[PDB]
Amino acid sequence: MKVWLVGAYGIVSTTAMVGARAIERGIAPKIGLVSELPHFEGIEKYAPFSFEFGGHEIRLLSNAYEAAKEHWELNRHFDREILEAVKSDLEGIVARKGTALNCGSGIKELGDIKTLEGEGLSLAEMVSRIEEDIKSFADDETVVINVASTEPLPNYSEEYHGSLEGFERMIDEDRKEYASASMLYAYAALKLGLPYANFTPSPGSAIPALKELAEKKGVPHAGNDGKTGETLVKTTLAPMFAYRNMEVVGWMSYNILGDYDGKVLSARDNKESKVLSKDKVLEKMLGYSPYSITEIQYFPSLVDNKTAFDFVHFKGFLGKLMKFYFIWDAIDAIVAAPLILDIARFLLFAKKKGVKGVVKEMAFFFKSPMDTNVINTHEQFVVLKEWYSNLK
Amino acid sequence: MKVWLVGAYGIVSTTAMVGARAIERGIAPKIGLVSELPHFEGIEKYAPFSFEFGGHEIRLLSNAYEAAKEHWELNRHFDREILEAVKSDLEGIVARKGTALNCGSGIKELGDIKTLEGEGLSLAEMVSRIEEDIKSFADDETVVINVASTEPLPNYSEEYHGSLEGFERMIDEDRKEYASASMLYAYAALKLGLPYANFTPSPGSAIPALKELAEKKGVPHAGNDGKTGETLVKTTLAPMFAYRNMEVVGWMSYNILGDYDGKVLSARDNKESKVLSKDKVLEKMLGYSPYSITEIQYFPSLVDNKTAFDFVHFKGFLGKLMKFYFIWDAIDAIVAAPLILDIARFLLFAKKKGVKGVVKEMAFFFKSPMDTNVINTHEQFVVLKEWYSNLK
Amino acid sequence: MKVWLVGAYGIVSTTAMVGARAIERGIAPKIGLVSELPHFEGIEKYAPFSFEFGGHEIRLLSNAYEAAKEHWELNRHFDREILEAVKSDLEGIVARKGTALNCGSGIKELGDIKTLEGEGLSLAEMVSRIEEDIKSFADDETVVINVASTEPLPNYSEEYHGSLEGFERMIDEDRKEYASASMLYAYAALKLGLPYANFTPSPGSAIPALKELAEKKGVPHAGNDGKTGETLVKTTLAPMFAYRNMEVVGWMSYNILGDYDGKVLSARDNKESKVLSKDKVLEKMLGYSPYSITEIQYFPSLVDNKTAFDFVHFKGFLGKLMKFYFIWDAIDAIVAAPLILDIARFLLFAKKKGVKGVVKEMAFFFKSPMDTNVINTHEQFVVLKEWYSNLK
Amino acid sequence: MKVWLVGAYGIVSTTAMVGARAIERGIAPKIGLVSELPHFEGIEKYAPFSFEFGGHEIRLLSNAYEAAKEHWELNRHFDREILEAVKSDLEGIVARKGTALNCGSGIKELGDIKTLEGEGLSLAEMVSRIEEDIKSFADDETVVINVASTEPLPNYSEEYHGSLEGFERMIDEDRKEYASASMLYAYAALKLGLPYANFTPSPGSAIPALKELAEKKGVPHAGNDGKTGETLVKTTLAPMFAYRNMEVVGWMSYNILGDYDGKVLSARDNKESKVLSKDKVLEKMLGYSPYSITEIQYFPSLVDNKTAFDFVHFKGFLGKLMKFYFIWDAIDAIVAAPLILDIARFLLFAKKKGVKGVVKEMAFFFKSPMDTNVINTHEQFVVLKEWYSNLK
Ligand SMILES: NC(=O)c1ccc[n+]([C@@H]2O[C@H](COP(=O)([O-])OP(=O)(O)OC[C@H]3O[C@@H](n4cnc5c(N)ncnc54)[C@H](O)[C@@H]3O)[C@@H](O)[C@H]2O)c1
Ligand SMILES: NC(=O)c1ccc[n+]([C@@H]2O[C@H](COP(=O)([O-])OP(=O)(O)OC[C@H]3O[C@@H](n4cnc5c(N)ncnc54)[C@H](O)[C@@H]3O)[C@@H](O)[C@H]2O)c1
Ligand SMILES: NC(=O)c1ccc[n+]([C@@H]2O[C@H](COP(=O)([O-])OP(=O)(O)OC[C@H]3O[C@@H](n4cnc5c(N)ncnc54)[C@H](O)[C@@H]3O)[C@@H](O)[C@H]2O)c1
Ligand SMILES: NC(=O)c1ccc[n+]([C@@H]2O[C@H](COP(=O)([O-])OP(=O)(O)OC[C@H]3O[C@@H](n4cnc5c(N)ncnc54)[C@H](O)[C@@H]3O)[C@@H](O)[C@H]2O)c1
Ligand SMILES: [K+]
Ligand SMILES: [K+]
């Protein structure tokens, strides 16, 4: 199948790409792949484990391997043997000039940046470019996944964001104001009849406009922020107290990271996005709002080794307060990189099973699920499970 | 409803007894009460929150206020203000001499408190008086909960505990060695047709003999080792890793504390039982067996402050290892106590719905679920929600 | 001896008060007291354990005990017996209406409080009044200490703070724009030839203009900002790396609490002073500046149980990266309180040994030691051991 | 300078060998070296940085290079490319068959490997071979260091271990029952006018028979258990509540690993030796003997990356108990490796300065230091400073 990646040079895109061909070459085991669990067997008939990549990007590199070798020097999240060996497959992957419209002043790492608006461009011609780039790559088994970096919180207007006739006029009114980059991608792909997936905390297809579109064109889309490590753990441990009819007092979340992602989440603009999702998760799991603290600080030495520090203050039986801590220590590119593949694969399956509109049974992967207030891990996982069952 | 408690002076028995009144008295919230959760609405038409207690005990102390007193001063797990408002009551509840038998090794610190073995009553005699105080205690709504010390691995008899003739023959042929104090209390309770629950890792009513002596009497019994906190977290977070298809390479479980629990668990006799119960757990939650280490250690200064250090070493995409920690800091007696009243309330209802034999669907409370393989908390929680549902 | 405490009603203050009588009487041990370490044996002939109390307050309570209860009733930071024993003494202690000149944004409560600054007073009639309660109270063996709410970064004016005649001028000039609370407290005591010390990060006597008026008066003042919890460990553990020639790439520091302490140190004004002492420490111990983050966040669940989480990322041989974690779990008031009485006897003894001005040999108690660069805890502990001996 | 290493095919020997070459090539930094700290400037006059490597191994292979590569294979504790660079050098390092006369009865790999002690040779017959391997390599700049597998306690005698004559007689009297493998090396070093160092919890030259051997042999020696991971932290943080007169109630030391160190320490007679130095620490530093548990457990998945879990339960002012945690995440090999050089260099210095017998001032490198009680890390460091200055 073919995958069209946004921000195709990121640590997670290339972990994907390196991963996919490592397994295809029967080199790498398939650990992490949710699509490979014993409950979804048979999925190879509609979504076999075979991949073809391409996509947009705004970082100036040669191809996809030279972007993959870069992040590896910093983190080395996989042995040098798997990279050299997949060095060839990716020398042919070459991202194309994309757009970065309204994505925070937390952006600065490319002296060269004459990209979309860089070239004195219009909404119209920008959309035509992106459309023309996915178009020439896309086939019948193609999926578009946003994996670029955290954008700020755009200001929704129901005029240009609340009716496909609006957003389409927003493009004709050259309204670069309300237009965000992650909307152009979703609109691009949903337009082209391709299934879309948003791993990032950006709105993307998460607007009324770009909901009316898929549904009107029969496209099953899904997302709103990979739930890959910390938040996984909190959406898995919080209901534990609701089951034991204890009350939580305060939850503290504290995360420190330093590569391109930690780099952009530095400011309180774009960072302000993703922070939210990992905060609000808790109300909708308990039915009460404990005092919650969630912060993400820069920490250059860890690079992609996202570390997270949690403490939960909880009360039981006789009014007592008690205490629970956990430290998460992993490399984001490892817990996220399969998800990008599981997603493509469930989305391809969905497409073929006549699934259109949003896939609220894919909540399992995301921390801001569209059209659902299912946050509990084993409960999302059951819904994910009972969905497939019902379509097999 | 009434509740007989073997181990009447324990910190869990008094703290259950302390809260029971303090709530019925209106001087305490209903925090931590699983049967108080909105789901189980209307169970109070069968078992309303109203208790009266009594029980067996080897540590001879004056009344019930005294014991609770003794524990509040080491642990202070609630307010002394409550201590004295629960004064009159617990002054009232007086324990009865029970039996200690062929198993316990750390089960001796209350000096020459020798009772049954010190002199020489007969097996059938103790069981006679044992059933005496109970029988005389019981009534319509009596539930027999064993919340006493933990005995070691019960040297099982294929000729004695394999059938009712057996146990009834041992009990007559005075086969004292294959006999343990808790098999006893479970025999009397059941033989009187009163529901039974094993909050310890002790055999209790796990043998065939007693099971078949429960089936025949039409009585419901169900439990084995309350599932309180560390282990409670081990079966809520373990399925995480499985949900996402990660391998689990090692789990470290190190527990510390030393009131009366950590005391007897200085010896590996009755210590083995409890620990084994937290370890085997992992296997059936993910199908494979990671290298496991589980240890309980005497730390007197923490007393009931059961504190735990756990660590999960797991493998992701491409084989990268990743690390995960958590520490648990609390009083076993406050997170234990409301699961004594819950089970009792739960054990009544089931009775008045016609239930008999091992309530397999009550596994949600114990780490050693009788007659079932469902260890996952969310699996157990849903089950329970259901088993009530069909019996409503 | 006699002791005046700015902010007599705070939690530290009364934990020093309560403990004092608790120990004067014989109903508590002297554990945690530094002047009771063998080395300083013979200090009692100069500063024996016996205390008389007074202070200033802007949070009018009827008496010290009344303030001892609210901090206790939320924190239960010591036995109820100790309090019950002391209540009668603390009830006899009454705070005198204090100043709040330039106390940044955090001092929200009194709202409309009138009796000192707010009572239409000038700075002249003000400064004298603060000198008229410590005039009357104080004798020959009195000493002044600041354990008040933290004060924001003081806008430094070299005219009125760089000269003693300037600060005088400041007074009849009603120069409240350069005047802050501590400064006038610290100005009065020193006026009075009364030894003075500062437990808060506030400038207090840490201006040129006061170092002069003290030496010109012949009085020994001390420190700045008490070093009670996490910077204690920092200035203890960091050199471990320096002595082992490893390099610190980054240090995380995160603290949470939620009482008055938390309250005012919830805003940028006040809390900026605290952080900087905390964080800055690192620079002076290893001789290099690694990446370091120091934060404080308002957790209204812990209160004075301030909890801190630290992360150290270090390199050794061959450039390999390594990590070390730690969590600080203790009551602030309790690790602070003994310090107060120590600083008291260590001040009189200076007074009694002739010493005037900054006693930079008491660096050991603080985060920002006045006039010195000894920040290593064992360094400042030898120093202070040296200093007693020489004056001895 | 020459350095002969017992247990030369170990990850720690190998790491110092790799890091040595690397550094002398100007291609590897100087981090981790105590001897390269400014204070010790001029050290270069007697013991520059250049090493010549040889040593004894009982698991003889082709060279040091394939042993280093093996270790690297699993641990990956340094840049792949450094081993290539150094490769040709270690390749030309071929240890010889050492000997493990009495290591208990718990090894698992050296199987058929024994051209030495396992070839039918007397005590006297093995020494003269062992003494013949180090001489052939030795000069006047050569030193012998012990970094072999840990050993259980030995069967001491007042006749064989209490005198070099009584000892010597034990060698040509075939009393193999007393002859430790370590003593046979240290004895071989020292009896050649060569300095020795013991980085293990194993005996070595720490018996009166050999302590006296170096006095008359006019050779300095030192060590017994190089203090690296956790225990460095212990003797560095424990003094902290001393200075503040706080009381240490209990300390918990929980270490997990799994290489040839972890593999060997399986049993406890072996484990006896190590945990001892990992326990006696606290009493010898505080004056207090708190409740201490020091434990070490296998966990194959961590290989060399030893992981320590410690907890301190400490009492404060008005009896307040409070807690302190921390986690040591790091690689054993890497922190210990540079110490081997250091110890080596500081051993050369002491020989040129006429120092014979134990070098008590070298105590800063060890957790079991000979002939002194100074355990304190800051105390051991200063003591190393002045010892060198004195000899400067
Ligand atoms: N565990 C995790 O990895 C995880 C989990 C949840 C969310 N996420 C989110 O995934 C996203 C990407 O993660 P990452 O670690 O790979 O960060 P990254 O910055 O390394 O990858 C972003 C890549 O996209 C490029 N890019 C940025 N804006 C773009 C645009 N408008 N058009 C095209 N390319 C653009 C960037 O220059 C870079 O090449 C972030 O939003 C992050 O918050 C990651
Ligand atoms: N969170 C927890 O407390 C929890 C969870 C899992 C299992 N358990 C098990 O439940 C038990 C009780 O816990 P605890 O903290 O109150 O221990 P405890 O020592 O405080 O109380 C045990 C009580 O049982 C009494 N007893 C012991 N043997 C007896 C006998 N033969 N007959 C009558 N009385 C007897 C003891 O003297 C004491 O009064 C232990 O066996 C423990 O292993 C506890
Ligand atoms: N471990 C700690 O508790 C600790 C450690 C080091 C430094 N500090 C700092 O020292 C102070 C004492 O801490 P705390 O927890 O006791 O806070 P606190 O609020 O309990 O004590 C402050 C007290 O001083 C009073 N006060 C404040 N400003 C005043 C003024 N201008 N005049 C008169 N009274 C005034 C307050 O109303 C209150 O009674 C804080 O500034 C804190 O930042 C605290
Ligand atoms: N952080 C540190 O690494 C640390 C700290 C304290 C102590 N130590 C000690 O240093 C030593 C080396 O550590 P390692 O982790 O590299 O272990 P390692 O097992 O990988 O290396 C030990 C080596 O000694 C060899 N050996 C064992 N018995 C021998 C004998 N009789 N004669 C000759 N060679 C023999 C083994 O074959 C092996 O190559 C161990 O005793 C360890 O406990 C290391
Ligand atoms: K990432
Ligand atoms: K090691």
The DSSP secondary structure of C92-160, one letter per residue, reads T---EE---TT-TTT--S-SS--SSTTTT--SHHHHHHTTTTHHHH--SSEEEEE-----PPP---HHH
Taking the CA atoms of chain C, what radius of gyration do you get in angstroms?
A: 20
Resolution of this model in Å is 1.9
Tokens representing residue D264 in the block? 């060997």
**Strand, helix or coil at D321?**
strand
DSSP annotation of A358 reads: B
Q: Which CATH architecture has domain D1-228+330-392?
A: 3-Layer(aba) Sandwich (3.40)
Q: Which class for C140: exposed (0-12), middle (13-18), buried (19 or more C-beta within 10 A)?
A: exposed
Tokens representing residue D307 in the block? 């992981």
Q: What is the largest CA-CA distance in chain A?
A: 67
End-to-end CA distance of chain B: 19
Residue A357 near residue A383 (C-beta atoms within 8 A) = no
Nearest residue, CB atoms, A311 vs list C250, C295, C307 = C307
Nearest residue, CB atoms, A327 vs list B247, B325, B329 = B325
Q: Kind and range of the H or E element at B327?
A: strand B321-331
List Cβ neighbours of D165 (8 Å cut-off, separation of 6 or more).
Answer: none
Q: Please state the length of chain A.
A: 392
Q: Which residues line ligand 1 (CB under 6 A)?
A: A 6-7, 9-12, 56-59, 98-100, 103, 147-150, 181, 199-200, 225-226, 228-229, 260-261, 274, 332-333, 335-336
Q: Which ligand is nearest to the CA of A337?
A: 1
Residue that has been written with the tokens 């996984």 in this structure = A232
The side-by-side arrangement of strands in the sheet containing C196-198 is C96-97, C52-57, C2-6, C142-146, C196-198, C220-223, C357-358
Tokens representing residue D61 in the block? 């292979």
DSSP annotation of C312 reads: E
End-to-end CA distance of chain A: 19
**Helix C208-215 vs helix C181-191: angle between axes, to the nearest 10 degrees?**
10
Q: Which class for A263: exposed (0-12), middle (13-18), buried (19 or more C-beta within 10 A)?
A: middle
Residue B368 near residue B224 (C-beta atoms within 8 A) = yes
Tell me if C151 CB under 6 Å of ligand 3: no
> Angle at CA B295, nearest 5°, toward B291 and B299?
155
Phi, psi angle pair for B74, to nearest 5°: -90, -45
End-to-end CA distance of chain D: 20
Q: Kind and range of the H or E element at D96?
A: strand D96-97
Using DSSP bridges, classify how beta strands C247-257 and C291-298 pair: parallel, antiparallel or unpaired.
parallel
In terms of phi and psi (left: phi > 0; alpha: psi -120 to 50; beta: otherwise), the region of B354 is: left
**Helix B164-173 vs helix B208-215: angle between axes, to the nearest 10 degrees?**
110
Dist. CA D372–CA B270, nearest whole Å: 43
**Strand, helix or coil at A256?**
strand
Q: Choose from A80, A318, A366 for mutation: most chain B CBs within 10 A.
A: A318
The side-by-side arrangement of strands in the sheet containing D357-358 is D96-97, D52-57, D2-6, D143-146, D196-198, D220-223, D357-358
Residue D187 near residue D160 (C-beta atoms within 8 A) = no
Dist. CA D135–CA D146, nearest whole Å: 16
Helices (H), chain D: 11-24, 64-75, 80-91, 123-135, 164-171, 181-190, 208-217, 229-243, 260-264, 269-277, 283-286, 332-352, 377-391
Dist. CA A10–CA A57, nearest whole Å: 9
Dist. CA B235–CA B228, nearest whole Å: 11
Q: Please state the length of chain C.
A: 392
Dist. CA B340–CA B338, nearest whole Å: 5
HSE, side-chain direction, 13 A CA sphere, residue C191: 18
Of A55, A368, A360, whose CA–CA distance to A215 is shortest? A360
> Angle at CA A130, nearest 5°, toward A126 and A136?
140
CA B146 to mean position of chain CA atoms: 6
Residue that has been written with the tokens 């065939």 in this structure = B208
D189-207 core/surface letters (b: 16 or more CB in 10 A; e: else): bbbbebbbbbbbbbbbbbb
List Cβ neighbours of D216 (8 Å cut-off, separation of 6 or more).
Answer: D164
Residue A20 near residue A96 (C-beta atoms within 8 A) = no
CA distances from D303 to A24, B312, B370, D77, D306 (A): 30, 15, 38, 11, 7
Long-range own/partner contacts, residues A78-82 (CB < 8 A, 24 or more apart)? A78/A15, A78/A18, A78/B318, A78/B319, A78/B320, A80/D80, A82/A18, A82/A22, A82/A27, A82/A28, A82/B318
Sign of CA pseudo-dihedral B367, B371, B375, B381: negative
Q: Which class for D73: exposed (0-12), middle (13-18), buried (19 or more C-beta within 10 A)?
A: exposed
Q: Please state the length of chain B.
A: 392
Phi, psi angle pair for D309, to nearest 5°: -125, 105
Tokens representing residue D119 in the block? 């070839």
Of D200, D145, D202, D193, whose CA–CA distance to D341 is shortest? D145
Of B253, B250, B233, B236, whose CA–CA distance to B321 is shortest? B250
CA C238 to mean position of chain CA atoms: 23
CA distances from B387 to B46, B379, B382, C27, C30 (A): 15, 12, 9, 57, 59
- D31/C334 CB distance under 8 A: no
List Cβ neighbours of C84 (8 Å cut-off, separation of 6 or more).
Answer: none
Dist. CA C110–CA B274, nearest whole Å: 56
Phi, psi angle pair for B291, to nearest 5°: -50, 120
Q: Kind and range of the H or E element at D5?
A: strand D2-6
> Which parts of D236-333 are beta strand (E)?
247-257, 291-298, 307-315, 321-329
Domain with CATH 3.40.50.720 in chain C: 1-228+330-392
Of C271, B327, C299, C306, whose CA–CA distance to A293 is shortest? C299
Of D67, D22, D271, whose CA–CA distance to D152 is shortest? D271
List Cβ neighbours of D41 (8 Å cut-off, separation of 6 or more).
Answer: none
Dist. CA A336–CA A10, nearest whole Å: 12
Q: Please state the length of chain D.
A: 392
**Strand, helix or coil at B343?**
helix
The torsion of the CA quartet C236, C241, C245, C250, rounded to 10 degrees, works out to: -120
Dist. CA D211–CA D221, nearest whole Å: 9
Phi, psi angle pair for D252, to nearest 5°: -120, 125
End-to-end CA distance of chain C: 19
Dist. CA D111–CA D2, nearest whole Å: 30
CA distances from C126 to C114, C121, C174, C186, D24 (A): 13, 6, 10, 13, 70
**Strand, helix or coil at C335?**
helix
List Cβ neighbours of C223 (8 Å cut-off, separation of 6 or more).
Answer: C197, C198, C199, C343, C362, C363, C365, C366, C368, C369, C370
Position A19: which residue type? G
The torsion of the CA quartet C98, C104, C105, C110, rounded to 10 degrees, works out to: 10
Pick the residue from chain C with its C-alpha nearest to D21: C318
Residue A24 near residue A342 (C-beta atoms within 8 A) = no
**Structure method:** X-ray
CB contacts, 8 Å: B299 with chain D: 250, 252, 291, 293, 313
Q: Which class for B82: exposed (0-12), middle (13-18), buried (19 or more C-beta within 10 A)?
A: buried
Of A107, A124, A134, whose CA–CA distance to A169 is shortest? A124
CB contacts, 8 Å: A291 with chain C: 299-301
CA D265 to mean position of chain CA atoms: 15
**Strand, helix or coil at B250?**
strand
**Helix B377-391 vs helix B338-351: angle between axes, to the nearest 10 degrees?**
40
Dist. CA D102–CA D148, nearest whole Å: 13
Dist. CA B310–CA B293, nearest whole Å: 10
- Mark out chain C residues that contact chain A at CB-CB < 8 A: 249-250, 252, 254, 256, 291, 293, 295, 297, 299-302, 307, 309, 311, 313, 321, 325, 327, 329
HSE, side-chain direction, 13 A CA sphere, residue B283: 11
Q: Kind and range of the H or E element at B91?
A: helix B87-92
**Helix D11-24 vs helix D332-352: angle between axes, to the nearest 10 degrees?**
70
Tokens representing residue B61 in the block? 């102390």
Tokens representing residue A185 in the block? 């991608």
List Cβ neighbours of C140 (8 Å cut-off, separation of 6 or more).
Answer: none
**Strand, helix or coil at A192?**
coil
Position A207: which residue type? I
Residue A314 near residue A321 (C-beta atoms within 8 A) = yes
The side-by-side arrangement of strands in the sheet containing A247-257 is A291-298, A247-257, A307-315, A321-329, B321-331, B305-315, B247-257, B291-298
Dist. CA C98–CA C282, nearest whole Å: 36
Position C134: which residue type? I
Q: Which class for B59: exposed (0-12), middle (13-18), buried (19 or more C-beta within 10 A)?
A: middle
Phi, psi angle pair for B259, to nearest 5°: -65, -115
Using DSSP bridges, classify how beta strands A96-97 and A52-57 pair: parallel, antiparallel or unpaired.
parallel
Dist. CA B35–CA C55, nearest whole Å: 53
Dist. CA A155–CA A162, nearest whole Å: 12
Position C164: which residue type? L
C290-319 core/surface letters (b: 16 or more CB in 10 A; e: else): bebbbbbbbbbbbbbbbbbbbbbbbbbbbb
Domain with CATH 3.30.360.10 in chain D: 229-329
- C236/D233 CB distance under 8 A: no
Dist. CA A322–CA A64, nearest whole Å: 49
Tell me if C334 CB under 6 Å of ligand 3: no
List Cβ neighbours of C247 (8 Å cut-off, separation of 6 or more).
Answer: C241, C288, C290, C314, C315, D31
Q: How would you write C146-177 as a 3-class SS string?
A: ECCCCCCCCCCCHHHHCCHHHHHHHHHCCCCC
Sign of CA pseudo-dihedral C60, C65, C67, C69: negative
Taking the CA atoms of chain B, what radius of gyration do you get in angstroms?
A: 21
Phi, psi angle pair for C144, to nearest 5°: -105, 135
Name the residue at shortest CA distance from atom 35 of ligand 1.
A7
Dist. CA D60–CA D93, nearest whole Å: 11
Dist. CA B69–CA B85, nearest whole Å: 12
CA B193 to mean position of chain CA atoms: 20
Dist. CA D82–CA D91, nearest whole Å: 14
Tokens representing residue C356 in the block? 């005037």
Dist. CA A365–CA C336, nearest whole Å: 47
CA distances from A238 to B171, B378, C155, C262 (A): 48, 12, 46, 26
Query: A229-329: which CATH number, 3.30.360.10, 3.30.460.80, 3.30.70.1350, 3.20.20.70?
Result: 3.30.360.10
> Which residues does a gap of C–N over 2.5 Å follow in chain B?
none
Q: Kind and range of the H or E element at A142?
A: strand A142-146
Dist. CA A320–CA D239, nearest whole Å: 33
Dist. CA A364–CA A376, nearest whole Å: 9
Number of H helices, E strands in chain D: 13, 11
CB neighbours of residue C62 within 10 Å: 10
**Helix D181-190 vs helix D123-135: angle between axes, to the nearest 10 degrees?**
50
Q: Choose from C33, C244, C339, C381 for mutation: most chain D CBs within 10 A.
A: C244
Residue that has been written with the tokens 């008060």 in this structure = C17
Q: Is C12 annotated as belonging to a binding site?
A: yes
Beta-bridged to residue D209, according to DSSP, are none
Q: How far is the CA of B153 from the centre of ligand 2 (A)?
A: 16
Pocket test for ligand 1, best of A4, A11, A12 (most atoms within 8 A of CB): A12
CB contacts, 8 Å: D32 with chain C: 244-246, 316-318
Dist. CA C82–CA C80, nearest whole Å: 6
**Strand, helix or coil at C334?**
helix
Of B139, B147, B122, whose CA–CA distance to B192 is shortest? B139
Tokens representing residue D215 in the block? 């006095």
Dist. CA C344–CA A23, nearest whole Å: 71
The torsion of the CA quartet D367, D371, D374, D380, rounded to 10 degrees, works out to: -70
Residue D189 near residue D213 (C-beta atoms within 8 A) = no
DSSP-assigned letters across all residues of A198-232: E-SSS-TT-SSHHHHHHHHHT--BEESSB--SHHH
